[PDB]
Amino acid sequence: ARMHARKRGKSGSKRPPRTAPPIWLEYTVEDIENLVVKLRKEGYSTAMIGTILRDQYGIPTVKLFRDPDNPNRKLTITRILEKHGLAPEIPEDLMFLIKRAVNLRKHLEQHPKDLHSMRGLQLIESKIRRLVKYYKRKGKLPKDWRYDPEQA
Amino acid sequence: PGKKAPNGEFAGRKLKLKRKKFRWSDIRYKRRVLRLKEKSDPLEGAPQARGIVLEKIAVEAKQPNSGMRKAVRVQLIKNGKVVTAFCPGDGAIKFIDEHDEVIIEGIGGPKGGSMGDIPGIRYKVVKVNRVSLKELVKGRKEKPRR
Amino acid sequence: MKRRPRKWKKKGRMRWKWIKKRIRRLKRQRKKERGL
């Protein structure tokens, strides 16, 4: 079920099993790497780069090609960005959650009796800490980092 | 309710602790480990005892009954307590006199308490002046010291 | 007060809302009258 509520919900995306790219594609690997890098410099989130490739350029998910420099891995957007040095400086899951808990914290400063909104804040911060524990454990975040709300 | 709480492989400590915790909601175990029977018991863990009778009395029986049961007041020797004891048999009370020494057993009821329609009494007389009472009631032997 | 719903059953007793109110008055008298 959901993490905090307990509704089930099932909506999502259902993919076909497939190994090789489809026959009617024509974009070669380098023509797709340049497309991936061109869009990031328009200010696009790594989730909203794939939406546009799929909608407009007609490329089903980019995880159909292998990594050019490595036969083990498969291609993923974040593994293209770090090839050119454009990848984010903090996992953007964490960044979206943290940015969404900063203008709720200045709304709660003019309406301090809005007691039903300040529970969503506690729930957001629970999620932020759940993610920081994991990131610190996997070495993606330096150990001298803490979520201190009074900054930003 | 779910399945049952610590059914894991490395959960021995919590399972033992849950058992030791709920064993105290008992009454036969708490009463045997804290030793509550002694410290409140006029006879002190004995099967029998001896006393010296103070006065002879009669009790009324329970509700769906009628009649008077004869008994005595015994003053123990090892403690100094005063208990109430029952004289079993047809005409026994005519053999008990004051300033006599009597021997005392339990009366054998549920949980060690009392039995039948005599509800508050929990001891019975077996020997008078070192001469069994059962004999005296049915002839067969004579009572010393008057 | 940690009460038990078996006693609100009224068969062979008096009402419990009114036994509570009477226990409270004694827990007071034992307190003021030198409960110190």
């Binding site: 993919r15 099993p17 497939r18 | 894991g8 492989e9 | -």
Partner: protein, 129 residues
């Protein structure tokens, strides 16, 4: 959440065959699941089975024959010495050779009747009869 993909399979099998079904789908498919199906087959409890890939861990199709009374998982996974089998066979099964007791010995998965012939032990994972 999900904690045991083998228990789910065995309860699914014994729930389905009790109402008369002739096919089941064991959705999350380990290779321990496949290894236990292999020995449920050789003793004549199920029919034939195949592994279908679906891009995410694969599925198992198995046809039932209506030849089992009960199947389940021995969960805490106790260990057994090679001379202490009857103590457990008297706890799970209904007569002195009624059915099999599946053991995870150091040479694969097998029934206790073939562990006693080599004289080895291991962890008990399940039982069928």
């Amino acid at each position: 959440t999900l904690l045991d993909p083998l228990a789910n399979a065995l309860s699914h099998i014994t729930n389905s065959e009790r109402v008369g079904k002739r096919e089941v789908y064991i959705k999350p498919a380990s290779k321990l699941i496949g290894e236990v199906l292999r020995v449920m087959q050789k003793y004549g409890y199920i029919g034939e089975f195949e592994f279908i890939d679906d891009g995410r861990a694969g599925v198992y199709r198995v046809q039932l024959l209506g030849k089992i009374n009960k199947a389940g998982a021995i969960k805490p996974r106790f260990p057994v010495k090679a001379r202490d089998y009857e103590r457990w066979e008297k706890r799970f099964l209904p007569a002195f050779e009624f059915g099999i007791l599946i053991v995870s010995t150091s040479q694969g998965v097998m029934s206790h009747k073939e562990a006693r012939e080599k004289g080895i032990g291991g962890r008990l994972i399940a039982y069928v009869y």
